[PDB]
Amino acid sequence: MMEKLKEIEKVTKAIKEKILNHYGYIRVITHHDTDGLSSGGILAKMLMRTNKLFHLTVVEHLSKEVIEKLAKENEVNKPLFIFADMGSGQIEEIIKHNFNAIILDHHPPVIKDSFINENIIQLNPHIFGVDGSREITASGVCYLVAREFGYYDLSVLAIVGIIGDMQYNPLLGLNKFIVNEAREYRYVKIMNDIVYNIYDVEIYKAIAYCTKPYIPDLASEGKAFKFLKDIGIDPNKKQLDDTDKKKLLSAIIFKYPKIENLLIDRYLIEHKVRDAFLLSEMLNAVGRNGLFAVGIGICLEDDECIKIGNQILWEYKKNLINELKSVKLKKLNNIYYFEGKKGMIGIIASILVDDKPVIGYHIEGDIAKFSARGNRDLVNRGLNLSVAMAVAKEFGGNGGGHDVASGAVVSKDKVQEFLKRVDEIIGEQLR
Amino acid sequence: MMEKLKEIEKVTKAIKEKILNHYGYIRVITHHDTDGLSSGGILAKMLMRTNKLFHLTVVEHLSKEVIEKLAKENEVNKPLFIFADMGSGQIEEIIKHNFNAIILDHHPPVIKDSFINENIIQLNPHIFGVDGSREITASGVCYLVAREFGYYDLSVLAIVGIIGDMQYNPLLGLNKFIVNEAREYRYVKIMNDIVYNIYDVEIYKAIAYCTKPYIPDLASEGKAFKFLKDIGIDPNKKQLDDTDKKKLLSAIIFKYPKIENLLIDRYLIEHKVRDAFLLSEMLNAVGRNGLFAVGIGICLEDDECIKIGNQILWEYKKNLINELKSVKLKKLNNIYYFEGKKGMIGIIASILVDDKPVIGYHIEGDIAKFSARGNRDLVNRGLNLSVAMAVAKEFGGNGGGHDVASGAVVSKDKVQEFLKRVDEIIGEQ
Ligand SMILES: Nc1ccn(-c2oc(COP(=O)(O)O)c(O)c2O)c(=O)n1
Ligand SMILES: Nc1ccn(-c2oc(COP(=O)(O)O)c(O)c2O)c(=O)n1
Structure with missing residues (x-):
């Protein structure tokens, strides 16, 4: 090295x-x-x-x-x-x-x-x-x-x-x-810390708008406040301490069982935005809104750019939760799928992955474009999305990518037939 | 207003x-x-x-x-x-x-x-x-x-x-x-404070390299050190308490009674460089060394750009004291003038400005660049160096600026061009 x-x-x-x-x-x-x-x-x-x-x-x-x-x-x-x-x-x-x-x-x-x-x-x-x-x-x-x-x-x-x-x-x-x-x-x-402590906001808000992981049963301020009140945690404090975390993780496993996904190595950096995970989410939100020069200003530590960044982040997180609640998730045998908006099917799909792969698609012309997502435990059990999306070339289209993330294109009228095909390939990958 | x-x-x-x-x-x-x-x-x-x-x-x-x-x-x-x-x-x-x-x-x-x-x-x-x-x-x-x-x-x-x-x-x-x-x-x-407290360095260095006011008899580390020793001030202190302030003011005003502006209104700004007078000097030194992007960096409060700025500033202030000691001021009818280095011409002229306008110049290839400085007293008597330096077109160039500070360019007609500006500054006054 x-x-x-x-x-x-x-x-x-x-x-x-x-x-x-x-x-x-x-x-x-x-x-x-x-x-x-x-x-x-x-x-x-x-x-x-x-x-x-x-x-x-x-x-x-x-x-x-x-x-x-x-x-x-x-x-x-x-x-x-x-x-x-x-x-x-x-x-x-x-x-x-x-x-x-x-x-x-x-x-x-x-x-x-x-x-x-x-x-x-x-x-x-x-x-x-x-x-x-x-x-x-x-x-x-x-x-x-x-x-x-x-x-x-x-x-x-x-x-x-x-x-x-x-x-x-x-x-x-x-x-x-x-x-x-x-x-x-x-x-x-x-x-090492819990993911909710990176935001420096009231914990019920951090829980409510978290998408890493997304927990549907907690994805609102009301439900998050109430869950916290129940287990004896002050919902308005901005950092969970060690006793709070034990109580939270003990309770939350029943709603979200893969609780290892809630624990992270936090990076506290020498920057006005001291949490690197927060600065990363802020830059993402700002870039998705076209605020490129503001994003450079944030890297250069300008106070007003950081203020814009914080406002744009929480707006972006609120809107993302709302989009997530409006997804109509349909289930085949081995996968979920949903029709969504062109700019976000891939982001939404990765957020929704839990136990099975998730495929979002958008219909533009007569084309229908798909974005498929899995996770690492799915890959370790044998999932490969690139070859499952390749099957698009049987329905007059094109598809491929990585084992955990792939895309595809298939004529608008073959959508149901293409998903049935993909559902079967995947079910055989995981036996 | x-x-x-x-x-x-x-x-x-x-x-x-x-x-x-x-x-x-x-x-x-x-x-x-x-x-x-x-x-x-x-x-x-x-x-x-x-x-x-x-x-x-x-x-x-x-x-x-x-x-x-x-x-x-x-x-x-x-x-x-x-x-x-x-x-x-x-x-x-x-x-x-x-x-x-x-x-x-x-x-x-x-x-x-x-x-x-x-x-x-x-x-x-x-x-x-x-x-x-x-x-x-x-x-x-x-x-x-x-x-x-x-x-x-x-x-x-x-x-x-x-x-x-x-x-x-x-x-x-x-x-x-x-x-x-x-x-x-x-x-x-x-x-309100003594100017030497803006530098946050040893006071004998702050005195030695200060050019506002410039005090030629103190403009060296050795002499400034001795001058403070001899009145009861630790010359290695970095700030002056009120008793050493009063003791330095009276000693300076006694031996140099025409000196002014030892007491100044300091501007402590919300900026990584907290003293605006120091930030102003740092930007000048950086700009005169051609370090333009570093100067913008300093305005944006980058730590490395500020580090370079401190180093360049003290290099620049030492070089300037050496050039002041070496300058050959020449008298015409209504201006002084001198030749010097490209980065010092303007600042030296305004340091030496007293009774008449001062114009510095340097040769750079086939041309000569001039920096003329006056004072508000001279402008109140009708100076206007903008019109005066404009006559570089009468010699194949151009000039302009403010009434109290202007510049001009080209070529090697230096003394000829100089002759003309002395003429306007007669008529103008
Ligand atoms: N023949 C291919 C080869 C690669 N890929 C590909 O797929 C994704 C994820 O898919 P989307 O980001 O389009 O959802 C990438 O990052 C990526 O390089 C593809 O689509 N087709
Ligand atoms: N044709 C011109 C017009 C304006 N100026 C100008 O003059 C000064 C003072 O003069 P220096 O140039 O000596 O710094 C400025 O700050 C400055 O913008 C000039 O130089 N030439």
Whole structure:
């Protein structure tokens, strides 16, 4: 691990030299999710500290269109482009326009070389044998650059990215090295705790609007207040102590039996939003509302951006619970399914997973698009969603993905027939 | 005076909506001095809070060449341009290239319209009879916009600009409004104190490197150390209690009875750098070293940028004391002048300013850059260095600025060009 860093150092030292020696305009292009907003915050602090002004842009996807734009900016003043959380999959188009570019990306690469030509450096963990889907995130890749300047304090934003991208449990590889470095330098403290204590609000509100895990019987202030009053916990206190937690967990197992999902390692970071899980949820809510520049401001610790962020988070959590209560969950033999809204079927499906996989779909044209979700105990019993969604190619469509998360497309009139098929495949996977 | 605000608010509310309603790119251009870097920090926070991504650039001068560049960024995706601490004098060129522009400038305006056309809003306090040399800075103009959003905490950066532009004594007009508002909202506390207590370093170092007041006989660590030893003050203390204050004031006023401004109104602001006078000096030193993005970082309260700022500031103050000892002031008929280094020219001129205007210059390639400084006494007698330095066009260049402080460029006609400015300052006085 000490040795794997030494091979990565070769690429990060060249990235550092390329940034220091460049005196023109600098363009940063990042994603809108939590990992991309954290990456943008890391790059922003790092560039400022090395005396670089820059122009930051947030894109949902790096399409052929957007790369062709931006290439128009290249014609006079060829700026240095830093791509975060993107770029590796689009590298052919980036070479094609001869960008001066640094690509900081954890997605599977098309070209497995760190040094592409004279003008392009690619920092991608897959080139070093590190799985970008479980051992490092985009904000961790940026952090690896940042630490060549000795900016260890930016490790707190990598931890946020680690949470936002769902790589915190288990904590593997480079992610584990980053957290341990942050703890060594005292930028983070680690504390096993109950998930409700990350919000610093009245516990009955934390319970009421929690979606990790979602507990339907408690998903309202009234029901949460009453449940707490019953077991002798003051519903208005903002932190459960050890006696409260024992009493809560003892009672709650009857409503939600997988109570291990309520216990987490909390990360207390050196940041105005001291809970990394809360900062992660805040960045997520802000990015889903299009408040990109506010999200950078939150990473940069601006008080007014943090105030906006807190207001937008609790609005986003209230609306999510409401959407969750409006889902009409239908049950086949081995799965659940539901029709929902185009932007949220995947989020809703992952939230609803309990004992069986959950598939949401939305009907747009005559197309019908599906998002399937399971969990790790389902995978350990033999679930693989990619092959179950592949069956879409029998109903004139396309489907695949990962064992725990997949999608598919199938003509609008074959919906019932496709779900029956998927239901049977899955039932045989789990015997 | 509350009436002038009611007239300014109409332009600030329209700047507000013009920013809110823009969803393409946004370019911010500021100056590299304390006031311009503070303006950059104010606009950066304001824009982020309103969900605006932006590209900030810091230029030393808004030259014609610089304006033709930038204008090539209009050929596809036409940004909104925000100019701070500049643009009013260059207004005609801005109109010619048809920028979508907001001008936040306290230099004397060429066109005295707030709404130039449908494309340009110009917020100049001179347009409303407020003196941009004494009663508001470029920082305060940015803050008047910011307060339309309720961003009262941004007043602390306007106060830093007030200090960097030498408008804090006397505290007048709109700057007085801004200071009082920051006090009402508890973002600043005011406390009379000796200047040397702002540095929070050993006092003999604070005396040795102080240039307001500059005391050549104390401007060394050795002499300052001895001078304090000899009156009963531990020179390694970092702050002076009242008894050592009184003992230092009388000793200084006795041996140097013309010295002034040893007692100052300190502005303790809600900012990681708590002393606004120190923050103003730190931004100046950083900007003079070309560290523009680090200075914005300091405004945004980044710890590493502030660490660099402290280191650069003390490097800069030592270098400055060495240059002051070395300067060769030369007398013409109504000005002094000297050659010095690119980062020191302006500050030395205003340190040495006493009876007549002072003009420093440095050669940089094939041209010479001039920084002329006066005082308010000289302006009250009709100085106006803006018109005087304008005669760089009579020599193939350009000049401008404030009545009390202006600059000029090109080429190697230095003594010829110098001769002409002495001429106006005769007629002007
Ligand atoms: N032939 C394929 C291969 C992969 N995938 C894929 O599926 C998800 C989750 O699915 P959604 O996010 O679309 O619900 C991904 O993250 C992802 O790369 C697919 O859909 N089809
Ligand atoms: N053509 C011009 C017009 C204005 N100014 C200007 O002058 C000062 C004081 O002068 P320096 O340039 O010596 O700092 C400024 O703050 C500043 O914006 C200039 O330099 N040239």
